[PDB]
Ligand binder design. Structure first.
Ligand SMILES: CCCCCCCCCCCCCCCCCC(=O)OC[C@H](COP(=O)([O-])OCC(O)COP(=O)([O-])OC[C@@H](COC(=O)CCCCCCCCCCCCCCCCC)OC(=O)CCCCCCCCCCCCCCCCC)OC(=O)CCCCCCCCCCCCCCCCC
Ligand SMILES: CCCCCCCCCCCCCCCCCC(=O)OC[C@H](COP(=O)([O-])OCC[N+](C)(C)C)OC(=O)CCCCCCCCCCCCCCCCC
Ligand SMILES: CCCCCCCCCCCCCCCCCC(=O)OC[C@H](COP(=O)(O)OCCN)OC(=O)CCCCCCCCCCCCCCCCC
Ligand SMILES: CCCCCCCCCCCCCCCCCC(=O)OC[C@H](COP(=O)(O)OCCN)OC(=O)CCCCCCCCCCCCCCCCC
Ligand SMILES: CCCCCCCCCCCCCCCCCC(=O)OC[C@H](COP(=O)(O)OCCN)OC(=O)CCCCCCCCCCCCCCCCC
Ligand SMILES: CCCCCCCCCCCCCCCCCC(=O)OC[C@H](COP(=O)(O)OCCN)OC(=O)CCCCCCCCCCCCCCCCC
Ligand SMILES: CCCCCCCCCCCCCCCCCC(=O)OC[C@H](COP(=O)(O)OCCN)OC(=O)CCCCCCCCCCCCCCCCC
Ligand SMILES: CCCCCCCCCCCCCCCCCC(=O)OC[C@H](COP(=O)(O)OCCN)OC(=O)CCCCCCCCCCCCCCCCC
Ligand SMILES: CCCCCCCCCCCCO[C@@H]1O[C@H](CO)[C@@H](O[C@H]2O[C@H](CO)[C@@H](O)[C@H](O)[C@H]2O)[C@H](O)[C@H]1O
Ligand SMILES: CCCCCCCCCCCCO[C@@H]1O[C@H](CO)[C@@H](O[C@H]2O[C@H](CO)[C@@H](O)[C@H](O)[C@H]2O)[C@H](O)[C@H]1O
Ligand SMILES: CCCCCCCCCCCCO[C@@H]1O[C@H](CO)[C@@H](O[C@H]2O[C@H](CO)[C@@H](O)[C@H](O)[C@H]2O)[C@H](O)[C@H]1O
Ligand SMILES: CCCCCCCCCCCCO[C@@H]1O[C@H](CO)[C@@H](O[C@H]2O[C@H](CO)[C@@H](O)[C@H](O)[C@H]2O)[C@H](O)[C@H]1O
Ligand SMILES: N=C(N)NC(=N)NCCc1ccc(I)c(Cl)c1
Lengths: 97, 459, 347, 98, 113, 140, 63
């Protein structure tokens, strides 16, 4: 905040909703709760300039949880390789799949 | 410097609290008393400058300029109080306040030990100067003259501000004493070529340098007499004083960066001297005379020799009193005939015999008759430029000839010949006008008896 | 407008600005802008004439568009970081959209077209709020997001604002349009130094507000809105012409006045970072602002323009306008340079 | 056109006050203005200031330098040393490169 | 150091500005000028009118200026405390040089002929 | 713009002029289009055809200034065998100003352009040589 | 003033201006290092406060 009246007065106006790992109703956790907790605790107190490099691993995992871009790339590759073998007659899925 | 700054400020309460009919008497008397005490600044030493505090110091360069500045304030008050007689009382006090505030900025400008304090005061003098020209000038063109004066100066000053701040970043200080010991040489590069230009163009415009001088004849022709007096006597010398200080940190690059500006000055001085031979306006003639004289000062500062620095210091003081006298002389004619046309009123030596003596003395100093300090300054510069290159004596010689031609032409056209028949309001010279002229020429001629106190730090 | 309703609406303009400045959550920042926009519109329409209606409409369309880009940035930021904290943004596309969104809110070029028109179409008291108080909230956001702002984008906006503000004011005779283009020119200085030292952005912002408040208060004191109407002031109140002269020279940045202080400290910060060309270009271009300030001083103080016979009737009545804080503001606008080191209070 | 005041005539200060000094219209103020300019300008600044400058103590130590030089020449010539050496600084305190 | 505090507690370990501080005298002067301008714009006798009003202008300016000067001094003390502590924490970035005399350092000579 | 700017600065001065002239022309053409877009948007053309006419007039003028500067600056360097001399851009800059003056049928514009473009172009080469930063990265 | 007073007053002035000049240079280099490395009180851009996290057992175990 430009003026930190919330800290000066010790009143919580909006920071209860700033992060998804904050206290939720009935303790419902977000899907990326662990990832964001790890990132927040890694970067706590050292500043963004340091956190940008020293907490890169935690932030990258957190980003992967949020948007799942690497997982979708991986699944898109497997699904592509399956259609490659189905038409070429080189693989029969199992019954359970 | 507080023994001069504070009493200079106290002139403002004095003027505003004076009886309605005593504003000129009180301000004139007490500004003369301040001028008297300024002689204490001549406690100069052979090796060390006079360093009062972390803010202000006074060496042999700034001391004579300070004394010139404080002497000029009483003279400007005497010169203005006639044409301001019909002025509203409050607008008379505001006029005097502009002059007092100009003196204040000026004496602080010449003694600032830090160059960024020098810059602010150096720039601050614009406001009172501009207001004097545009509020109390007489013609329509005073408004255009104000704009040319303002924007010519600022075009150069703003680059100087960037350069000084860059210099403080890299060197760590702008204190002039510190710069003397921490100065490093400037090595060739396009980066330093423009650092050099930024450091010198603001001062070149104030001198002015030929080519960049067009603001000056405009300002003089439109300024009131007091404005013209301070403009020619002191404000031009802010360029010279600034250059004499900043060139310390521009070496050895000044060796080749000087060439374009020496060429402009050496040739420009002949061009502006010749312009004077065909001027129709008496004030404009004197304005163009200043450009020619200040061209020598620019050359002397740029060739960077002990003799040239002594010559430049004497030229600035000598020109200050002479050009101020000439503007005052032309003004006394103007207050009678209300025109600046040189050929309008002729043969005035017949009607005003004693004022014709002042015209003679002023002209003789302007052409540098020996042993006037006008000649001492001009001669020392010519000696040093001869060693810089022998061929410069050709251009120096011609300028001396043309300078005599227009100085005596101005004397002959206005003072000699037959009087103009239809002009019949040439009243006898007032005591105020004669005392004003003598307070210019007597100190100027007295300084010949003891010229070392106006020869600067290298004496 | 009922006086109580006017006070409630004014306090809501301030509450929306305050919410932006104290919020740690991007949603509450957006709410603050929306609340501020809702309250100011009736102040624009207060006099109910076609020009006020046009001004308010143009203002509403611009601010409402900026808020949608602002919220788009917040949501993109949420996708790529999963949080709402007001700080650097975590996506360059979000940074651009938010930066443009704040540029339109401030009226920086080339999003500037609304500022001259809206200012002209509303009263002087409303124009004062628009060109002063309304800058606080967007600047307070830039102050917090600058570590992720694209340098080329922000310096491009700053350069264009200084040029367009300077050129735009040269052709204006209407005082409200002169103030509008001056505001655009001054906005550029604030954002030009933001990447290097946000403390100098606040200094420029504070000094700009004091000088701009002083001018508007003096225009309101005499009910003047055009150059020629202002040229009669020497015949009514001579003192006010001297205050205008001192204030205008200050806005031009002339030493030893206060308005030189921000230009001076911004050039220092830029040179420390080896930025030499940009401050030089900025200082020279600011001479355009000085030019059309100097014209006003000529027509107002340094000459005496023709008057009218009916002007004599006004000699017999005193100034009744409140002119709140004008004695303090004018002194601050002019005589503050000796106290420049006090800028560390903003650190 | 407009309603304007005509240009006023020229006032010759000598008409009302043949003894005018050109300072003020009031003769008593005109005399005082003249007195302060002449007393403070000529009698004080120019006369006393000129006297003060003439008796300045050894402005920039030019006399001491002449006395000091005499002392050195007397000493050096008596002892057979050069009047002045080409080297300003003792070469033993210098360390050339290379 | 304290979040959104005008004067943190640690600022009390610094000496307060003197009541004869030259900077404070200037601020008081600005209040005097404001009082004069107030009389002038309202067409009252500038020096005489409303000395109670003129007193409050001087007093309010000096009051606010005293606290601004105290915070100003505090922020410069903090800057130096931060700067020196950082130098201590990173000796290898601020190494003490071996200081050569001018008799050893070679500087090139540029004649002014 | 970064891609086209990089290409110009990646082929050494005085070498492969044709490639240089393509880069300056590409920069010039883009600048002309940007000018046309705002001009058409803010000063509506009376007809679609005219708006196209205005677009081509500006884009050609801009591209010509770019090509002639790129041609002149490279050819002058190769001929003079002075690849890294700011004077080459001064020749190229002025030539561009003349093209602008010709396209406008105004000598006075041509005179002023040849000067200010001449200095500005020469100032750019010095900046490249000495590393002058226009949008300087924050450092302290 | 005698030459001795002015001489030694000058040394006092030079000491202050030299000390200030050295600090000005040191501050520029400290600012350069602090901004580049983010390891000092200056240029300390905020990160999310970790006291905002709730560590209580959640509705589901894997978090
Ligand atoms: C992801 C993709 C992006 C997402 C969007 C995808 C598209 C989906 C639809 C989006 C909504 C589009 C809304 C269109 C609209 O409302 O415009 C009405 C607008 C004005 O409406 P109007 O009142 O009916 O005026 C009728 C005549 O046009 C006016 O009559 P006139 O007498 O004034 O005629 C003079 C005319 C002459 O026109 C010209 O001079 C053109 C010269 C161009 C040189 C080539 O003036 C102009 O048109 C100048 C403006 C030309 C556009 C600016 C070009 C610079 O008309 C138009 O401008 C035509 C545009 C319609 C096609 C829009 C194409 C959509 C793509 C936009 C760019 C996407 C970038 C991403
Ligand atoms: C006989 C033949 C005719 C000779 C021509 C007549 C002239 C000679 C008569 C004088 C004889 C006496 C004499 O020379 O001694 C004087 C001496 C010069 O000779 P001196 O240097 O040997 O001093 C004599 C005294 N002792 C021996 C102790 C050294 O002093 C002076 O000349 C006075 C200098 C006056 C200059 C100062 C001007 C006043 C300043 C007022 C402030 C306002 C000025 C404007 C600002 C200017 C900027 C600085
Ligand atoms: C005119 C206005 C319109 C045009 C815009 C003006 C800005 C363009 C001027 C370019 C001048 C060149 C320049 O700016 O030098 C930059 C240079 C950067 O060097 P730097 O990296 O900081 O130091 C290490 C060197 N490798 O900087 C330095 O090294 C130090 C240079 C000191 C500061 C120089 C300030 C620029 C002066 C330019 C104007 C000078 C001419 C004035 C003309 C006045 C005419 C009346
Ligand atoms: C301190 C350190 C920092 C330095 C920064 C600079 C500090 C100065 C800041 C100035 C602040 C503004 C206040 C200036 C007070 C001016 C007082 C004044 O002008 O006199 C009042 C008078 C008004 O007239 P009136 O009230 O009716 O009295 C009877 C006459 N009719 O006025 C008049 O009647 C005059 C009407 C004619 C107009 C003449 C205009 C030319 C004179 C302008 C002088 C003031 C310029 C100020 C600009 C800055 C100067 C550096
Ligand atoms: C530090 C800067 C302080 C700036 C203080 C500004 C004080 C300006 C006082 C204006 C003169 C008094 C006045 O005439 O009131 C104008 C206006 C009220 O509107 P009015 O037209 O007078 O009447 C309403 C009836 N329909 O009054 C208003 O509406 C007040 C508008 C100004 C509020 C914004 C002030 C600038 C931002 C301050 C933030 C500083 C950080
Ligand atoms: C130790 C003190 C040193 C003084 C430093 C002055 C610095 C500038 C301060 C600016 C503030 C000045 C006060 C505000 C102006 C109010 C005065 C006025 O409006 O008119 C003059 C007035 C007399 O006229 P009247 O209106 O009839 O009132 C009767 C009271 N006798 O009232 C008067 O009797 C005279 C009141 C003062 C007149 C000031 C005139 C304008 C000064 C501004 C010029 C710029 C200041 C110099 C710049 C360098 C700063 C050091
Ligand atoms: C950055 C370094 C420089 C430091 C800058 C410091 C600036 C901030 C300092 C405050 C500036 C404003 C000070 C104004 C002083 C003049 C007040 C005055 O004399 O009022 C006279 C009278 C009203 O006074 P009254 O309300 O009765 O007093 C009780 C206040 N609670 O009735 C009147 O006639 C007053 C009318 C003239 C005043 C203009 C209108 C404003 C109304 C203000 C109301 C009173 C405010 C009291 C100020 C106390 C501030 C501590
Ligand atoms: C963020 C990144 C944005 C970078 C580019 C932004 C440029 C801003 C352009 C809009 C602001 C300028 C508005 C303007 O100057 O007027 C529009 C102008 C109309 O004039 P024009 O058609 O060019 O000439 C007619 C000849 N009688 O039309 C124009 O041609 C202006 C072209 C300016 C292009 C720059
Ligand atoms: C009123 C205007 C007055 C204008 C005066 C004009 C003066 C002209 C000075 C030109 C000399 C500039 O200084 C010169 O710059 C270049 C910078 O690239 C330096 O040289 C440097 O760049 C050149 C590239 O051209 C390289 O070949 C060289 O290896 C490198 O060291 C030179 O070492 C220096 O001698
Ligand atoms: C060391 C510092 C020295 C500072 C010296 C300053 C010198 C100033 C000289 C001015 C002296 C004039 O003193 C003057 O005396 C008389 C009597 O009291 C006053 O009063 C006079 O006013 C008018 C003049 O207009 C007279 O005609 C009248 O007889 C008388 O009443 C003047 O108003 C005052 O101006
Ligand atoms: C190394 C890269 C070099 C890049 C060079 C870039 C140069 C900059 C070009 C900017 C765009 C051209 O600029 C534009 O040219 C056209 C020329 O017709 C001018 O147009 C003007 O001249 C002609 C004839 O009068 C007409 O086109 C038009 O009626 C008139 O306004 C525009 O007034 C000008 O704004
Ligand atoms: C009307 C006047 C307007 C203001 C005029 C001001 C002119 C200022 C000149 C622009 C600055 C210098 O111009 C810019 O310098 C930088 C160096 O930092 C160059 O930077 C370049 O260096 C390397 C070579 O070493 C190139 O391979 C690379 O493409 C590029 O990064 C840019 O190619 C050049 O465009
Ligand atoms: N340049 C920035 N973005 N920040 C900034 N002001 N850095 C400079 C560091 C600094 C300067 C003065 C003080 I007092 C303090 Cl405590 C800290």
């Amino acid at each position: 905040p430009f003026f930190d009246v919330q800290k000066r007065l010790g009143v919580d106006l909006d920071r209860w909703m700033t992060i998804q790992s904050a206290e939720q109703p009935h303790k419902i956790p977000s899907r990326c709760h662990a990832f964001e907790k790890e990132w927040i605790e890694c970067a706590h107190g050292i500043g963004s300039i340091r956190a940008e490099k020293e907490c890169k691993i935690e932030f990258e995992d957190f980003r992967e949880c949020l948007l799942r871009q690497k997982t979708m790339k991986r699944l898109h590759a497997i699904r592509r390789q399956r259609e490659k073998l189905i038409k070429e007659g080189k693989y029969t899925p199992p019954p359970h799949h | 410097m507080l023994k001069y700054i504070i009493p200079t400020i106290m002139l403002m309460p004095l003027t505003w609290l004076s009886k309605n009919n005593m504003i000129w008497v009180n301000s004139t008397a007490h500004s003369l008393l301040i001028s008297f005490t300024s002689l204490l600044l001549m406690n100069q030493f052979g090796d060390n400058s006079l360093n009062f505090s972390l803010l202000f110091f006074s060496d042999s360069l700034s001391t004579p300029l300070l004394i010139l500045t404080m002497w000029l304030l009483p003279l400007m008050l005497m010169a203005s109080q006639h044409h301001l007689s019909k002025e509203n009382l409050t607008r008379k006090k505001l006029f005097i306040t502009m002059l007092i505030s100009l003196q204040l900025f000026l004496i602080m400008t010449f003694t600032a030990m830090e160059l960024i304090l020098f810059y602010i005061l150096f720039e601050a003098t614009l406001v009172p100067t501009l207001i004097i020209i545009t509020r109390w000038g007489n013609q329509t063109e005073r408004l255009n003259a104000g704009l040319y004066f303002l924007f010519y100066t600022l075009a150069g000053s703003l680059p100087l501000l960037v350069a000084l701040i860059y210099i403080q970043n890299t060197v760590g200080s702008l204190n002039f004493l510190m710069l003397q010991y921490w100065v490093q040489p400037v090595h060739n590069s396009w980066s330093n070529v423009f650092m050099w230009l930024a450091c010198m163009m603001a001062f070149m415009v104030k001198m002015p340098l030929y080519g960049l001088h067009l603001w000056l004849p405009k300002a003089h022709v439109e300024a009131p007499i007091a404005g013209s007096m301070v403009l020619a006597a002191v404000l031009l010398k802010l360029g010279g004083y600034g250059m004499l200080r900043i060139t310390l940190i521009l070496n050895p690059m000044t060796d080749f960066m000087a060439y374009p500006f020496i060429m402009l000055s050496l040739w420009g001085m002949i061009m502006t001297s010749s312009i004077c031979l065909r001027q129709t306006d008496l004030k404009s003639l004197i304005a163009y005379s200043s450009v020619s004289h200040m061209a020598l000062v620019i050359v002397a500062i740029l060739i960077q020799t002990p003799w040239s620095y002594m010559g430049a210091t004497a030229l600035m003081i000598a020109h200050g009193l002479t050009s101020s006298m000439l503007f005052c002389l032309a003004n006394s004619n103007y207050e009678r005939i209300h025109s600046r046309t040189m050929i309008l009123a002729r043969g005035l030596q017949t009607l005003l015999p004693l004022m014709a003596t002042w015209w003679l003395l002023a002209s003789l100093t302007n052409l540098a008759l020996p042993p006037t300090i006008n000649l001492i300054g001009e001669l020392f510069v010519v000696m040093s430029t001869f060693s810089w290159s022998n061929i410069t004596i050709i251009l120096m010689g011609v300028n001396m000839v043309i300078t005599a031609l227009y100085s005596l032409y101005m004397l002959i056209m206005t003072q000699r010949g037959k009087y103009t028949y239809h002009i019949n309001n040439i009243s006898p010279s007032f005591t105020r006008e004669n005392a004003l002229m003598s307070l210019h020429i007597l100190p100027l001629l007295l300084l010949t008896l003891n010229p070392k106190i106006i020869l600067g730090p290298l004496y | 407008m009922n006086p109580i309703i006017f006070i409630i609406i004014l306090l809501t303009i301030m509450l929306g600005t305050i919410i932006v400045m104290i919020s740690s959550h991007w949603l509450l920042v957006w709410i603050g802008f929306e609340m501020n926009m809702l309250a100011i519109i009736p102040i624009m329409m207060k006099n109910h004439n076609p020009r006020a209606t046009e001004a308010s409409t143009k203002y509403f369309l611009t601010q409402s568009t900026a808020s949608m880009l602002l919220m788009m940035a917040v949501i993109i930021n949420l996708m790529f970081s999963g949080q709402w904290t007001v700080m650097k943004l975590f996506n360059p596309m979000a940074s651009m959209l938010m930066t443009m969104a704040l540029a339109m809110k401030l009226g920086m070029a080339p999003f500037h077209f609304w500022v001259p028109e809206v200012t002209q179409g509303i009263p002087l008291s409303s124009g004062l709020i628009l060109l002063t108080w309304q800058k606080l909230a967007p600047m307070s956001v830039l102050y917090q997001i600058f570590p992720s702002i694209n340098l080329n984008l922000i310096l491009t906006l700053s350069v264009l604002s200084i040029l367009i503000g300077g050129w735009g004011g040269l052709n204006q005779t209407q005082l409200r349009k002169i103030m509008a283009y001056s505001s655009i020119a001054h906005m550029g200085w604030m954002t030009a130094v933001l990447p290097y030292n946000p403390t100098m952005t606040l200094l420029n912002l504070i000094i700009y507000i004091i000088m701009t408040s002083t001018m508007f208060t003096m225009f309101m004191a005499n009910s003047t809105t055009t150059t020629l109407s202002l040229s009669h002031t020497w015949n009514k109140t001579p003192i006010m012409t001297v205050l205008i002269l001192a204030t205008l020279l200050s806005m031009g940045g002339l030493p030893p006045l206060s308005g030189f202080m921000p230009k001076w400290m911004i050039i220092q910060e830029m040179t420390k970072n080896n930025s030499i060309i940009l401050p030089t270009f900025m200082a020279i271009t600011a001479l355009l602002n000085l030019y059309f300030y100097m014209r006003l001083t000529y027509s107002t103080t340094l000459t005496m323009f023709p008057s009218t016979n009916n002007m004599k009737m006004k000699w017999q009545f005193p100034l009744m306008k409140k002119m709140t804080f004008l004695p303090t503001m004018v002194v601050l606008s002019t005589m503050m340079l000796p106290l420049t080191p006090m800028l560390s209070v903003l650190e | 056109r407009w309603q304007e005041d005509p240009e006023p005539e020229d006032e010759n200060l000598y008409e009302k006050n043949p003894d005018s000094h050109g300072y003020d219209k009031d003769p008593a103020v005109d005399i005082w203005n003249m007195r302060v300019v002449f007393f403070f300008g000529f009698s004080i600044v120019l006369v006393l200031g000129s006297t003060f400058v003439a008796y300045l103590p050894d402005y920039r130590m030019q006399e001491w330098a002449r006395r000091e030089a005499e002392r050195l020449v007397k000493y050096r010539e008596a002892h057979g040393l050069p009047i002045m050496e080409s080297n300003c600084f003792d070469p033993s305190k210098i360390q050339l490169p290379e | 150091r304290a979040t959104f505090q005008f004067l943190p507690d640690e600022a009390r370990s610094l000496p307060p500005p003197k009541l004869t501080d030259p900077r404070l005298a200037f601020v008081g002067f600005l209040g005097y000028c404001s009082g004069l301008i107030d009389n002038a714009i309202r067409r009252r006798p500038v020096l005489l009118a409303g000395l109670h009003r003129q007193l409050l202008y001087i007093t309010s300016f000096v009051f606010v200026g005293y606290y601004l000067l105290k915070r100003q001094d505090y922020m410069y003390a903090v800057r130096d405390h931060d700067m020196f502590s950082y130098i201590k924490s990173h000796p290898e970035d601020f190494p003490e040089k071996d200081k050569k005399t001018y008799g050893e350092v070679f500087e090139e000579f540029h004649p002014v002929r | 713009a970064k891609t086209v700017l990089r290409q110009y600065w990646d082929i050494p001065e005085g070498t492969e002029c044709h490639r240089k002239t393509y880069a300056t022309t590409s920069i010039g053409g883009a600048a002309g289009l940007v000018v046309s877009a705002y001009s058409v948007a803010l000063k509506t053309p009376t007809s679609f055809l005219e708006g196209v006419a205005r677009t081509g007039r500006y884009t050609f003028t801009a591209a010509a200034i770019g090509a002639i500067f790129g041609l002149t600056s490279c050819i002058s360097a190769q001929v003079r065998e002075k690849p890294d001399d700011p004077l080459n851009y001064l020749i190229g800059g002025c030539a561009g100003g003349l093209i602008l003056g010709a396209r406008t049928r105004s000598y006075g514009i041509g005179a002023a352009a040849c000067a200010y473009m001449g200095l500005t172009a020469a100032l750019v080469k010095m900046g490249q040589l000495e590393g002058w930063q226009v949008f300087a990265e924050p450092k302290v | 003033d005698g030459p001795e007073k002015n001489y030694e007053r000058t040394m006092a002035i030079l000491q202050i201006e030299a000390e200030k000049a050295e600090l000005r240079l040191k501050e520029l280099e400290v600012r350069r290092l602090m901004r580049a490395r983010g390891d000092g009180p200056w240029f300390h851009y905020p990160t999310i406060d970790k006291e905002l996290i709730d560590h209580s057992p959640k509705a589901t175990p894997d978090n």
